Scaffold this active site. Sequence first.
Site, PDB file in Angstrom:
ATOM      1  N   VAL A 258       0.812  -1.219   0.000  1.00  0.00           N
ATOM      2  CA  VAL A 258       0.000   0.000   0.000  1.00  0.00           C
ATOM      3  C   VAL A 258       0.847   1.271   0.000  1.00  0.00           C
ATOM      4  O   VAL A 258       0.531   2.223  -0.697  1.00  0.00           O
ATOM      5  CB  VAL A 258      -1.124   0.021   1.100  1.00  0.00           C
TER       6      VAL A 258
ATOM      7  N   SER B  17       4.654   3.549   1.812  1.00  0.00           N
ATOM      8  CA  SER B  17       5.711   3.656   2.817  1.00  0.00           C
ATOM      9  C   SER B  17       5.865   5.035   3.385  1.00  0.00           C
ATOM     10  O   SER B  17       5.449   6.021   2.783  1.00  0.00           O
ATOM     11  CB  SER B  17       7.063   3.118   2.317  1.00  0.00           C
ATOM     12  N   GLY B  18       6.440   5.069   4.582  1.00  0.00           N
ATOM     13  CA  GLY B  18       6.771   6.302   5.287  1.00  0.00           C
ATOM     14  C   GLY B  18       8.279   6.351   5.473  1.00  0.00           C
ATOM     15  O   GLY B  18       9.024   5.641   4.794  1.00  0.00           O
ATOM     16  N   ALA B  19       8.731   7.196   6.394  1.00  0.00           N
ATOM     17  CA  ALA B  19      10.156   7.245   6.726  1.00  0.00           C
ATOM     18  C   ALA B  19      10.582   5.999   7.532  1.00  0.00           C
ATOM     19  O   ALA B  19      11.674   5.447   7.299  1.00  0.00           O
ATOM     20  CB  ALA B  19      10.483   8.529   7.476  1.00  0.00           C
TER      21      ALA B  19
ATOM     22  N   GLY C 149       8.998   2.851   8.035  1.00  0.00           N
ATOM     23  CA  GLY C 149       8.679   1.498   7.572  1.00  0.00           C
ATOM     24  C   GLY C 149       7.786   1.494   6.357  1.00  0.00           C
ATOM     25  O   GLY C 149       7.424   2.556   5.837  1.00  0.00           O
ATOM     26  N   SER C 150       7.429   0.315   5.875  1.00  0.00           N
ATOM     27  CA  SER C 150       6.448   0.264   4.799  1.00  0.00           C
ATOM     28  C   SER C 150       5.245  -0.652   5.141  1.00  0.00           C
ATOM     29  O   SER C 150       5.297  -1.457   6.067  1.00  0.00           O
ATOM     30  CB  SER C 150       7.128  -0.110   3.492  1.00  0.00           C
ATOM     31  N   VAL C 151       4.161  -0.497   4.397  1.00  0.00           N
ATOM     32  CA  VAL C 151       2.853  -1.070   4.742  1.00  0.00           C
ATOM     33  C   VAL C 151       2.211  -1.889   3.603  1.00  0.00           C
ATOM     34  O   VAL C 151       2.100  -1.420   2.451  1.00  0.00           O
ATOM     35  CB  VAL C 151       1.890   0.047   5.185  1.00  0.00           C
TER      36      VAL C 151
ATOM     37  N   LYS D 292       2.678  -3.541   8.916  1.00  0.00           N
ATOM     38  CA  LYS D 292       3.741  -2.556   8.759  1.00  0.00           C
ATOM     39  C   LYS D 292       5.036  -3.214   9.128  1.00  0.00           C
ATOM     40  O   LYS D 292       5.219  -3.646  10.280  1.00  0.00           O
ATOM     41  CB  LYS D 292       3.507  -1.373   9.696  1.00  0.00           C
TER      42      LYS D 292
ATOM     43  N   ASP E 135      -0.412   6.731  14.106  1.00  0.00           N
ATOM     44  CA  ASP E 135       0.827   7.285  14.685  1.00  0.00           C
ATOM     45  C   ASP E 135       1.634   7.989  13.587  1.00  0.00           C
ATOM     46  O   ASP E 135       1.964   9.174  13.703  1.00  0.00           O
ATOM     47  CB  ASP E 135       1.648   6.211  15.391  1.00  0.00           C
TER      48      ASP E 135
HETATM   49  O1  LIG Z   1      -5.490   1.322   6.384  1.00  0.00           O
HETATM   50  C1  LIG Z   1      -4.529   2.038   6.100  1.00  0.00           C
HETATM   51  C2  LIG Z   1      -3.297   2.128   6.995  1.00  0.00           C
HETATM   52  C3  LIG Z   1      -3.237   1.137   7.965  1.00  0.00           C
HETATM   53  C4  LIG Z   1      -2.151   1.088   8.815  1.00  0.00           C
HETATM   54  C5  LIG Z   1      -1.110   1.995   8.693  1.00  0.00           C
HETATM   55  N1  LIG Z   1      -0.050   1.943   9.517  1.00  0.00           N
HETATM   56  C6  LIG Z   1      -0.006   1.010  10.464  1.00  0.00           C
HETATM   57  C7  LIG Z   1       0.043   1.436  11.775  1.00  0.00           C
HETATM   58  C8  LIG Z   1       0.085   0.518  12.831  1.00  0.00           C
HETATM   59  C9  LIG Z   1       0.053  -0.846  12.548  1.00  0.00           C
HETATM   60  F1  LIG Z   1       0.068  -1.769  13.539  1.00  0.00           F
HETATM   61  C10 LIG Z   1       0.004  -1.282  11.225  1.00  0.00           C
HETATM   62  C11 LIG Z   1      -0.027  -0.372  10.184  1.00  0.00           C
HETATM   63  F2  LIG Z   1      -0.093  -0.894   8.929  1.00  0.00           F
HETATM   64  C12 LIG Z   1      -1.176   2.979   7.718  1.00  0.00           C
HETATM   65  C13 LIG Z   1      -2.263   3.053   6.858  1.00  0.00           C
HETATM   66  C14 LIG Z   1      -2.111   4.239   5.878  1.00  0.00           C
HETATM   67  C15 LIG Z   1      -3.410   4.906   5.425  1.00  0.00           C
HETATM   68  C16 LIG Z   1      -3.935   3.933   4.411  1.00  0.00           C
HETATM   69  C17 LIG Z   1      -3.865   4.391   3.092  1.00  0.00           C
HETATM   70  C18 LIG Z   1      -4.313   3.535   2.071  1.00  0.00           C
HETATM   71  C19 LIG Z   1      -4.787   2.260   2.383  1.00  0.00           C
HETATM   72  O2  LIG Z   1      -5.247   1.380   1.449  1.00  0.00           O
HETATM   73  C20 LIG Z   1      -4.847   1.466   0.053  1.00  0.00           C
HETATM   74  C21 LIG Z   1      -5.341   0.184  -0.682  1.00  0.00           C
HETATM   75  O3  LIG Z   1      -5.214   0.378  -2.088  1.00  0.00           O
HETATM   76  C22 LIG Z   1      -6.799  -0.219  -0.369  1.00  0.00           C
HETATM   77  O4  LIG Z   1      -7.697   0.663  -1.066  1.00  0.00           O
HETATM   78  C23 LIG Z   1      -4.841   1.831   3.700  1.00  0.00           C
HETATM   79  C24 LIG Z   1      -4.424   2.670   4.711  1.00  0.00           C
HETATM   80  C1  LIG Z   2      -1.326   6.134  17.965  1.00  0.00           C
HETATM   81  C2  LIG Z   2      -1.793   7.395  18.662  1.00  0.00           C
HETATM   82  C3  LIG Z   2      -0.632   8.022  19.402  1.00  0.00           C
HETATM   83  C4  LIG Z   2      -0.007   9.109  18.523  1.00  0.00           C
HETATM   84  C5  LIG Z   2       1.397   9.517  18.973  1.00  0.00           C
HETATM   85  C6  LIG Z   2       2.294   9.868  17.767  1.00  0.00           C
HETATM   86  C7  LIG Z   2       3.756   9.487  18.023  1.00  0.00           C
HETATM   87  C8  LIG Z   2       4.678  10.149  17.005  1.00  0.00           C
HETATM   88  O1  LIG Z   2       5.660  11.063  17.571  1.00  0.00           O
HETATM   89  C9  LIG Z   2       6.181  11.910  16.490  1.00  0.00           C
HETATM   90  O2  LIG Z   2       7.671  11.914  16.334  1.00  0.00           O
HETATM   91  C10 LIG Z   2       8.188  12.994  15.396  1.00  0.00           C
HETATM   92  C11 LIG Z   2       9.727  12.869  14.974  1.00  0.00           C
HETATM   93  O3  LIG Z   2      10.583  13.862  15.598  1.00  0.00           O
HETATM   94  C12 LIG Z   2       7.687  14.339  16.007  1.00  0.00           C
HETATM   95  O4  LIG Z   2       8.257  15.520  15.390  1.00  0.00           O
HETATM   96  C13 LIG Z   2       6.176  14.400  15.891  1.00  0.00           C
HETATM   97  O5  LIG Z   2       5.786  15.694  16.360  1.00  0.00           O
HETATM   98  C14 LIG Z   2       5.516  13.279  16.709  1.00  0.00           C
HETATM   99  O6  LIG Z   2       4.147  13.152  16.332  1.00  0.00           O
END
Ligand SMILES: O=C1c2ccc(Nc3ccc(F)cc3F)cc2CCc2ccc(OC[C@H](O)CO)cc21
Ligand SMILES: CCCCCCCCO[C@@H]1O[C@H](CO)[C@@H](O)[C@H](O)[C@H]1O
Length: 343
Positions: A26, A28-30, A32-34, A49, A164
């Site tokens: 689906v 990625s962020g800084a 990890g990926s999902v 993730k 988060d």
């Molecule tokens: O549901 C979503 C989601 C879920 C989790 C997560 N992080 C995360 C955090 C904590 C944990 F334990 C596990 C995790 F994976 C981040 C997202 C990002 C927003 C998003 C964007 C697009 C999506 O579907 C595109 C497909 O194409 C289906 O249409 C799904 C989601």
């Molecule tokens: C899951 C609900 C709890 C949300 C808490 C979010 C935890 C993320 O902590 C993040 O770390 C960053 C890196 O420096 C900070 O700059 C962000 O302000 C902060 O949101």
Amino acid sequence: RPTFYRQELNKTIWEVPERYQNLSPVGSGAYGSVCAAFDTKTGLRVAVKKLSRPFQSIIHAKRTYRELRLLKHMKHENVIGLLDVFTPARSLEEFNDVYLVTHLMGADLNNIVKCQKLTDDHVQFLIYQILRGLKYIHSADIIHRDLKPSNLAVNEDCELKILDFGLARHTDVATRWYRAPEIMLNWMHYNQTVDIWSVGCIMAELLTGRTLFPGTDHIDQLKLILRLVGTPGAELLKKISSESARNYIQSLTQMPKMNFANVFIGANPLAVDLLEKMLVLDSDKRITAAQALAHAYFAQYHDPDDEPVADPYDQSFESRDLLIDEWKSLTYDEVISFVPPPL
Ligand SMILES: O=C1c2ccc(Nc3ccc(F)cc3F)cc2CCc2ccc(OC[C@H](O)CO)cc21
Ligand SMILES: CCCCCCCCO[C@@H]1O[C@H](CO)[C@@H](O)[C@H](O)[C@H]1O
Ligand SMILES: CCCCCCCCO[C@@H]1O[C@H](CO)[C@@H](O)[C@H](O)[C@H]1O
């Protein structure tokens, strides 16, 4: 201990227990990926993730532990939570990888505008759900700090969950626009209504279809903010310790507060009223999450018997300077001691 299998997806290798099938990237962020997957055990669609390089450094190590200790604690329907955590490793000595599992949700609020206006009743329900999870997160003494659209996960039912971290990259949105001014001036202290400002910025964007404060940098950002809410008076000015910031704000063409009523023309005057109360410069006067739930705007949703607070949350580790190995072994304890919820 289940049977795992490997797969390569986008040069990430994934090693997962077979209960999870049909892995589909689906984004990625800084950190990890999902992937989307099918959880054969529960029958649910899930998001898994894979943390990226959990233990590269004391910063990473402590972040991984933080995330695991954070998501383990959240049990609220507007806050993302844990269905499962696993590692392919068999001992601490070989422990390197952390996977976290949650409900698939399928989109983020960034992704369900299409640059567009939603009707008053979705806004209500959406901001409601945000505040509801916010009441809960704050009651645990946590402050999100980076609430933005991509940090909000929403499904087909318009049900919403606070992430988060959301995705920077999608397989198929600047922080600063949503940051409370006190955070932009590097205040070494803030309160929880830092997140409330963010909710205000989001709300605004939903009703209008355009970003409240699209600042080109941190200075531009403040300029934009001051334009709407007006330059601060003396009782607020007495509170900034730094000469450079004070001197900057005071060197500005002093601006009046606008009539939110003239800027959010069209919008439910109740909506407008809530905005006034969220988008106040002085953090001491911004309405809290718990108060905003009782604001008339949410009348068709408000229920104080169904707006739960969190267990208290040990943040003492946040102040410790430990080694990668210690941080590592703590995280491991947390993988090992994980109790899944009941289906
Ligand atoms: O549901 C979503 C989601 C879920 C989790 C997560 N992080 C995360 C955090 C904590 C944990 F334990 C596990 C995790 F994976 C981040 C997202 C990002 C927003 C998003 C964007 C697009 C999506 O579907 C595109 C497909 O194409 C289906 O249409 C799904 C989601
Ligand atoms: C899951 C609900 C709890 C949300 C808490 C979010 C935890 C993320 O902590 C993040 O770390 C960053 C890196 O420096 C900070 O700059 C962000 O302000 C902060 O949101
Ligand atoms: C846009 C430039 C204006 C800066 C004003 C931001 C007001 C921040 O608000 C301040 O928060 C502090 C803690 O963070 C409290 O101690 C102060 O009482 C509160 O006024």
